[PDB]
Amino acid sequence: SLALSLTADQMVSALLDAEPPILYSEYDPTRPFSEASMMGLLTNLADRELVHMINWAKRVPGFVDLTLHDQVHLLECAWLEILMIGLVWRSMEHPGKLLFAPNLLLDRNQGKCVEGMVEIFDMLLATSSRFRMMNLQGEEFVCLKSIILLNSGVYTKDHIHRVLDKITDTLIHLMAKAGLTLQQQHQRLAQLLLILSHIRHMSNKGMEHLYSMKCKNVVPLSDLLLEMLDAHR
């Protein structure tokens, strides 16, 4: 596997260069405020984002080395986590706001349209605020997102764990360059990875709410999104 020969800087540059673009939402409406309208915009945005994620995943060092079916499993398992940490990352420089798209900036009041959305919004905003106070860097973000991809579905494998250790080495290397002490390095590393437990929690809770939407047949989600959904049951 080529991914293990990579240096820390080679790992960073590979992840940064593989970053998906920031997509736009459908322009105009009435500035949502209906259950079908908002969930429609989010579903449309997420569906287009998934296409870029799949190509982003293929560029994550070590992901190509896995079996196709193993690639499917990891993506099916982590896709909402990856979407959320991206949303949370974009929403960093916008306190109290969730930047789904540059033309779609939401607060918790706009989540009252959908039942259970305010709860998830508050958790997402809390994560973004956590990222902000930690002053999360982009180099750290792309490592966290790659970790989510490889880790979330590994227990549902020697190669993956080897790559996971590689990303850990990269994270430490990033913090060492930032002038962090040895104590500050393992502390920040722990702080970052503990947030992943919450991203998992938000994804699980957020997933369930996508189920009830599918059963209510309120929003026409794509067949791709439906297949990513069925895999979690």
Binding site: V51, I54, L68, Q71, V72, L75, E76, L224, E227
Partner: peptide, 10 residues
């Protein structure tokens, strides 16, 4: 099969 299958090898 899956759409995800197609998109992973394109």
């Amino acid at each position: 099969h899956k759409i995800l299958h197609r998109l992973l090898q394109d």
